[PDB]
């Protein structure tokens, strides 16, 4: 049984659709565990200036009180069968998935229905939850990686809802009352923009009638006429420099406008992003890793950790690299990393393209093990691509891309495009913005 034969097996992702619009998708397998969750299209992208941070507050208060479940009784029931209930709210989507055994499926769907639908949103709990969010805001401010990405989002999509932080500015969280949250839930937690996902020992028919018997009350109405609309955002090549010399290391994240969620150029780009790769000081490869930038960094101990990201929203995304290094390396990497891009832009050979193809294949297959990654893949793919792309299709797209495709795609995305650099820490050797922009083009090509 070769890779191709094993790829086809790939138990399918049968997708149904309730009359309310809730597209129920499942993935049957043999393990006695399962992951059932609801992926809603609600995030900082839809939040406005006045209520920015309502999504985080609703995520906080979702598990607290749900009317029918009086409160901590929900926690009691969840821990009774050993289920682990978790929620993650990104800039676009928000999910509440229960990680539980297969037999507890009828109760798990009911619990998710209770959370997404009948939430008490008690004012006293709002007051208690208000302090927690502020504390988490300080912890995130201490998070020296999260803040640089928030800075990149702010400086790149400036003046657009995308730049808004997921948690929200530490002024809205001190003013968000029950009325704002209830409006957010009413206007965003709608059945059409929801995917009920469950992977593992899940029968698709069982998930279907459980959703019908539980999630039927959800409606697609939008009050009188108010319908939130996706507002396209603009990528503004800029730079933000929060120089704080007291910090030990320096974080710098540089990105350009990339593709959207549904765009074929995503597949080659990751391959290119695989060629540059990622490195951390505790790797062991050292001076032998095939990635040229990683080998150069390890030879001189240039950085402490550089990674390449492919943040990709609906209409536009962020393509680039975030690197953490001491004060007197920011220049060098800014010369090297850009140069690597330039090389990938200028002259790419089939050898490293094949290497990147293998790395991307391995990342896709290894990322999809366990119930929760499969459930998350289903929930995100149904909302983003409109369907779960099977791994066979991914194999086809990866087989299609070659050196010419990578070169042309990088040229269309990387060559002579204004970046969106964003720094933090003792950023002083970081080259001026015109130096970075000048590095975006090569006077030989």
């Amino acid at each position: 049984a070769t890779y191709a034969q094993a790829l086809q097996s790939v138990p399918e992702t049968q997708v149904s659709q309730l009359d309310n619009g809730l597209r129920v998708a499942s993935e049957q397998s043999s393990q006695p565990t399962c992951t059932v969750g609801v992926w809603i299209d609600a995030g900082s992208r839809y939040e406005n200036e006045k209520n920015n941070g309502a999504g985080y507050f609703v995520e906080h208060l979702a598990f607290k009180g749900t009317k029918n479940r009086p409160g901590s009784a929900l926690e009691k029931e969840v821990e009774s069968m050993g289920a682990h209930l978790n929620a993650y709210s990104t800039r676009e989507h928000t999910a509440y998935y229960i990680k539980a055994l297969s037999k507890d499926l009828p109760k798990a769907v009911e619990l998710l229905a209770d959370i997404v639908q009948n939430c008490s949103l008690e004012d006293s709990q709002i007051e208690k939850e208000r302090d927690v969010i502020l504390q988490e805001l300080q912890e995130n401010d201490s998070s020296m990686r999260d803040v640089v990405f928030d800075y990149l989002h702010a400086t790149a999509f400036q003046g657009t809802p995308l730049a808004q932080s997921v948690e929200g500015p530490s002024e809205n969280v001190r003013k968000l009352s029950r009325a704002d949250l209830t409006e957010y839930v009413s206007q965003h937690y709608k059945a059409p923009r929801m995917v009920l996902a469950a992977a593992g020992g899940v029968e698709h028919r069982q998930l279907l009638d459980l959703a019908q018997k539980h999630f039927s009350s959800l409606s697609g109405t939008y009050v009188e006429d108010a319908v939130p609309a996706f507002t396209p955002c603009r990528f503004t090549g800029s730079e933000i420099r929060h120089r704080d010399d007291a910090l030990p290391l320096a974080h710098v994240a540089i990105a350009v406008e990339g593709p959207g969620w549904a765009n074929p150029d995503n597949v080659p780009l990751q391959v290119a992003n695989a060629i540059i790769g990622h490195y951390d000081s505790t790797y062991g490869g050292g001076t032998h890793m095939s990635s040229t930038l990683a080998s150069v960094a390890a030879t001189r101990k240039l950085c402490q950790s550089f990674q390449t990201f492919n943040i990709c929203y609906a209409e536009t995304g962020l393509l680039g690299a975030h690197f953490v290094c001491d004060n007197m390396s920011i220049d060098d990497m800014m010369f090297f990393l850009q140069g690597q891009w330039m090389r990938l832009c200028t002259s790419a050979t089939e050898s490293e393209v094949v290497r990147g193809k293998n790395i991307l294949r391995n990342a896709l297959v290894s990322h999809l093990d366990g119930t929760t990654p499969v459930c998350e893949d289903i929930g995100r793919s149904l909302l983003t691509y409109g369907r779960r792309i099977p791994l066979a299709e991914w194999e086809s797209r990866i087989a299609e891309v070659d050196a010419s495709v990578v070169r042309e795609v990088c040229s269309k995305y990387f060559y002579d495009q204004c970046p969106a650099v964003a720094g933090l820490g003792p950023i002083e050797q970081l080259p001026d913005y015109n130096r970075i922009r000048s590095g975006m083009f090569w006077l030989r090509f």
């Binding site: 730079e239 001026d432 913005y433 015109n434």
Partner: protein, 54 residues
């Protein structure tokens, strides 16, 4: 008198020709080089600064 002026300045015609050419050439050049300077320096001349002490 005109003959003597030519005699001590046997480049007058060509000197004024060069004057014309240089005048028009740099009437083009100054605006464009200045535009390049402002284009490159525009990052500095639009730096919104901030100060957020704890």
């Amino acid at each position: 008198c005109t003959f003597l002026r030519w005699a001590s300045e046997p480049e007058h015609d060509h000197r004024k020709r060069m004057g014309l050419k240089m005048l028009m050439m740099m009437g083009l050049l100054l605006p464009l080089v200045y535009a390049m300077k402002r284009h490159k320096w525009s990052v500095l001349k639009s730096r919104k600064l901030a100060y957020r002490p704890p």
